[PDB]
Amino acid sequence: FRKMAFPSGKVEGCMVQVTCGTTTLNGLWLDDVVYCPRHVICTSEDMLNPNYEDLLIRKSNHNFLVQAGNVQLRVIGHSMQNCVLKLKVDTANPKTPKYKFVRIQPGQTFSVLACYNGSPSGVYQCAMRPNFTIKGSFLNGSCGSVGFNIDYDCVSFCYMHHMELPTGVHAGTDLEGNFYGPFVDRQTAQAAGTDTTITVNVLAWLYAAVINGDRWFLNRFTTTLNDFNLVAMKYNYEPLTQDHVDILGPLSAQTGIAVLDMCASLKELLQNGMNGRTILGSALLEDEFTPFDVVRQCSG
Amino acid sequence: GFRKMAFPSGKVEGCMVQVTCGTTTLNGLWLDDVVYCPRHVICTSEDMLNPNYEDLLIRKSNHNFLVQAGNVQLRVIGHSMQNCVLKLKVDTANPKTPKYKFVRIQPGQTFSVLACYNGSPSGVYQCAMRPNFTIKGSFLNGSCGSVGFNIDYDCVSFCYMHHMELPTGVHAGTDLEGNFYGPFVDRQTAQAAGTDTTITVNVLAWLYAAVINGDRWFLNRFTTTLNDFNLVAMKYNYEPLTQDHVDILGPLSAQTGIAVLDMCASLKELLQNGMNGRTILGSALLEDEFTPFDVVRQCS
Ligand SMILES: *[C@H](O)[C@H](C[C@@H]1CCNC1=O)NC(=O)[C@H](CC(C)C)NC(=O)OC[C@H]1CCC(=O)N1CC1CCCCC1
């Protein structure tokens, strides 16, 4: 059982380079529009309190250099939607996949295609943290990298990368340019709210460890949902809802371990620790596999 | 702060096809006008328990092989066997063939796996070749012929093709010349992996990573010979170092100014003395699936 990203080819064919001034980041080219973070228009000065409408009205199409590979794309118009800039170009991307823009919920996972200068460099799986950060790997120049899920032939874009926080986690927007979380695209050190652990995902993973013949942490006991949640919140774990219990059904049927029985195992682990032992390779409880993720990878 | 990060998979996605013999379907790799796949596609279940591949192959003709990209049949105009891979000459050169080569990697090296079923990619993830020549993959029925690769500049270096799952649930396969990694054979018989050891060169890369990040409590004032370190390491189930290992730690040694053999002395002390309750990069466990290349690629 492995942390698996979606194949990235459909997204790679959409990545381009966007330059304004001495700022270069990545853009997402879909049909005849390139989406990118609007802070590409900010100067060293601007970035502390950028009045974006005011800065954007002063820009001309020819101030934006867009390159796909060796070719430059002519910008013929631009608009702003929240924190994303939309550069209209004179050419349609023939590699545009079937796609939609979605806003994901905390606890949900997605694949990130990390890009630099419009060129893809790596792909990995991340989750929207309960505090709306993402624990990514992003360096200078990664802005405009996107996160996505694939269903059949449809790419659902859910994330565009904008910034790193002082703690080393990351923040960004959906493809409508609305941030996840209380963050703002100005050059300031911003802290997130307190993070918590995605409890339904930890349970999915424990079930995964059992499908793979790992069951040392199981115990003969059970718990009510509310008593489990009391203990969870004590340990800064998210509460488990009845929908979460329902979502865990398939994994429960598969292994014949009731959801609330696994909650009793997880309660024991929180109270007792792992005592040196490890689970599916990990010394820590893992919370960035969803129920769907576990199944998709025990399915094909 | 480190993630397993795969290479973008699009260039390899554009090479994946399916190969069927009778009812047995696995994946093939289409490069120029050749399709490469595991030779056991020619085996019925009865042949698998104990196959005569040379005789099974003589009985076959080009018209027994169904090669498809999607649902589009690719006509086979020739066939041959190289070690445990079948090479199917086809009448169409793959228009999406990237620049590529076939390399045989050493234990400890990491690579990206594009897991595929019926010629369609399902996921990409990073694997390390263990010293016992197995990988901890996530592979189901129908995954054979999925490949492992690295990308350098625009060149895809193919290093792995998947063939089997061992009793303990780890995975084995060949290079793209059909030579198995390790002592395994493509027969449905009882086979076991050697006892595995820790990848010393990668632990050292991880210690260099910790130093780059300012986490350097474990550095000591002493040094060692390569021979004395190797003899100590084997007593802790660590792999001895090779000269090539010393060389691929070169860039990280230069980046930090810590000679390789001084780092070895620091690792020797950790082995002999333990962590004493402390952590490195946030963990009490030493990581051994990040190569020196992985470290630089995520730090720089
Ligand atoms: C876009 O490519 C870029 C990606 C960042 C760079 C390093 N890692 C990333 O993910 N994004 C930015 O540069 C944003 C631009 C703003 C106008 C939104 N800023 C940003 O990420 O910042 C850098 C981080 C580093 C940690 C931190 O504190 N900080 C904020 C500022 C102010 C406080 C002092 C440090 C610099």
Side-chain angles (χ1 to χ4, degrees), chain A residues 1-44 46 48-69 71 73 75-94 96-97 99-150 154-219 221-274 276 278-291 293-295 297-300, chain B residues 1-3 5-58 60-74 76-98 100-151 154-220 222-234 236-275 277-300:
Chain A
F1 195 77
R2 305 292 320 269
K3 226 181 232 170
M4 186 171 317
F6 291 103
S8 53
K10 290 175 166 71
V11 180
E12 297 170 46
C14 302
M15 300 312 297
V16 303
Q17 188 185 240
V18 181
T19 300
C20 182
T22 65
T23 300
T24 299
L25 40 59
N26 310 275
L28 180 71
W29 181 23
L30 298 169
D31 297 309
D32 64 0
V33 177
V34 178
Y35 303 77
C36 72
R38 69 185 178 176
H39 69 68
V40 73
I41 70 174
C42 296
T43 74
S44 207
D46 290 314
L48 253 62
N49 178 22
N51 190 322
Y52 278 107
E53 296 280 351
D54 214 56
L55 305 171
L56 185 58
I57 195 124
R58 303 171 194 271
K59 287 288 180 300
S60 286
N61 291 339
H62 73 264
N63 295 136
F64 301 109
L65 309 190
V66 178
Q67 297 214 107
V71 187
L73 315 183
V75 175
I76 58 178
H78 64 266
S79 50
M80 193 174 47
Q81 169 176 19
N82 303 303
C83 303
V84 292
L85 182 62
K86 302 195 278 198
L87 302 173
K88 175 70 74 59
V89 292
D90 68 357
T91 324
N93 187 0
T96 301
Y99 76 95
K100 67 169 96 86
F101 288 172
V102 302
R103 188 179 173 87
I104 56 154
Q105 307 284 306
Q108 292 201 253
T109 57
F110 59 96
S111 299
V112 170
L113 178 65
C115 298
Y116 298 93
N117 296 281
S119 304
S121 55
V123 55
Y124 53 88
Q125 198 73 354
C126 276
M128 185 55 63
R129 303 303 305 163
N131 69 356
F132 295 108
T133 65
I134 86 177
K135 298 165 177 302
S137 317
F138 294 114
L139 300 173
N140 279 344
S142 61
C143 286
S145 303
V146 296
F148 62 99
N149 285 281
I150 309 194
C154 192
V155 178
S156 292
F157 295 107
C158 62
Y159 181 81
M160 176 169 276
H161 184 54
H162 297 242
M163 64 200 302
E164 187 177 295
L165 304 192
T167 55
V169 305
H170 296 103
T173 65
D174 60 24
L175 269 296
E176 298 194 65
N178 288 313
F179 269 86
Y180 297 95
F183 309 105
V184 179
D185 49 343
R186 60 166 60 176
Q187 189 67 353
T188 61
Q190 301 170 50
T194 295
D195 204 20
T196 47
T197 295
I198 307 161
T199 306
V200 63
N201 288 5
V202 172
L203 290 171
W205 177 74
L206 295 179
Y207 276 112
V210 164
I211 301 178
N212 284 256
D214 216 352
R215 67 211 310 281
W216 64 267
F217 46 84
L218 301 185
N219 64 32
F221 301 111
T222 186
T223 180
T224 68
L225 187 60
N226 186 67
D227 291 340
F228 170 75
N229 281 337
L230 286 176
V231 176
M233 289 181 300
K234 189 186 185 198
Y235 285 86
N236 280 278
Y237 272 57
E238 288 287 293
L240 193 75
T241 69
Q242 184 54 57
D243 279 297
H244 295 152
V245 170
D246 290 340
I247 287 149
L248 289 159
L251 296 171
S252 194
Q254 180 153 0
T255 61
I257 304 179
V259 174
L260 294 173
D261 288 353
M262 193 69 81
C263 287
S265 290
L266 173 53
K267 193 194 293 181
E268 194 174 23
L269 286 165
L270 295 172
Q271 298 187 144
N272 293 2
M274 283 171 56
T278 63
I279 304 185
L280 280 174
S282 180
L284 306 155
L285 305 182
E286 164 72 52
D287 75 341
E288 300 200 347
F289 293 96
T290 65
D293 292 353
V294 170
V295 160
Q297 174 174 174
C298 299
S299 275
Chain B
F2 289 79
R3 295 195 139 270
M5 173 173 333
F7 282 103
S9 56
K11 296 176 159 58
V12 177
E13 290 169 61
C15 298
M16 295 313 299
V17 298
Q18 44 185 330
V19 180
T20 301
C21 280
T23 56
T24 308
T25 296
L26 39 63
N27 304 281
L29 190 72
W30 180 19
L31 301 165
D32 295 318
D33 61 352
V34 182
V35 170
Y36 303 79
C37 74
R39 70 178 175 171
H40 74 243
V41 74
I42 69 184
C43 296
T44 71
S45 46
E46 295 76 51
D47 308 322
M48 277 176 167
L49 265 49
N50 175 33
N52 181 4
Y53 279 110
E54 290 74 22
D55 162 74
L56 292 171
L57 186 70
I58 309 298
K60 282 274 183 142
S61 302
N62 298 321
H63 63 262
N64 297 123
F65 295 99
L66 174 59
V67 179
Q68 307 168 289
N71 289 331
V72 188
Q73 186 171 356
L74 227 193
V76 175
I77 62 176
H79 59 285
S80 63
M81 179 170 66
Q82 176 183 15
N83 302 309
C84 306
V85 302
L86 181 70
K87 300 193 285 188
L88 299 178
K89 194 77 147 180
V90 295
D91 71 353
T92 305
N94 185 354
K96 301 169 202 302
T97 303
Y100 73 95
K101 58 186 195 304
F102 291 168
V103 316
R104 186 173 176 82
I105 57 169
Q106 309 171 340
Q109 164 71 326
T110 55
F111 53 96
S112 298
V113 169
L114 177 65
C116 288
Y117 300 91
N118 304 287
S120 296
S122 63
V124 62
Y125 55 88
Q126 189 91 331
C127 284
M129 178 64 70
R130 300 308 303 182
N132 68 1
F133 289 109
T134 70
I135 63 169
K136 289 115 173 201
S138 177
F139 287 121
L140 305 169
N141 285 324
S143 61
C144 289
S146 300
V147 299
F149 60 96
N150 289 282
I151 303 186
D154 62 322
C155 187
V156 181
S157 294
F158 296 102
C159 59
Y160 178 84
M161 178 169 270
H162 184 53
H163 292 233
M164 51 182 260
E165 182 177 298
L166 288 172
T168 65
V170 298
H171 298 104
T174 66
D175 64 18
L176 267 299
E177 296 181 328
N179 286 314
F180 261 91
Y181 290 96
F184 310 105
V185 297
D186 48 352
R187 297 157 22 61
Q188 192 83 11
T189 199
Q191 296 175 68
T195 73
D196 200 25
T197 49
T198 296
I199 304 162
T200 305
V201 62
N202 291 356
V203 170
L204 291 167
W206 181 252
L207 301 183
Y208 279 106
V211 173
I212 287 166
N213 277 277
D215 200 359
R216 46 177 194 270
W217 62 262
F218 50 84
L219 297 173
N220 70 26
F222 293 118
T223 197
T224 182
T225 64
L226 197 60
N227 186 61
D228 281 333
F229 174 83
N230 278 358
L231 299 175
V232 173
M234 288 191 319
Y236 292 89
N237 257 272
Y238 270 53
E239 274 301 298
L241 295 166
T242 67
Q243 183 61 46
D244 288 342
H245 290 157
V246 171
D247 292 336
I248 63 174
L249 290 162
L252 282 171
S253 183
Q255 181 172 350
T256 64
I258 303 169
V260 173
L261 286 177
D262 299 1
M263 191 63 93
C264 288
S266 292
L267 177 50
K268 176 191 293 198
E269 185 187 321
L270 290 173
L271 291 184
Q272 297 179 326
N273 301 132
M275 306 277 274
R278 314 205 55 174
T279 62
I280 294 178
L281 282 169
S283 191
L285 305 193
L286 305 182
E287 174 66 49
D288 84 336
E289 301 210 324
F290 293 116
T291 70
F293 175 80
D294 286 316
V295 159
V296 165
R297 169 188 171 209
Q298 273 180 63
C299 281
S300 293

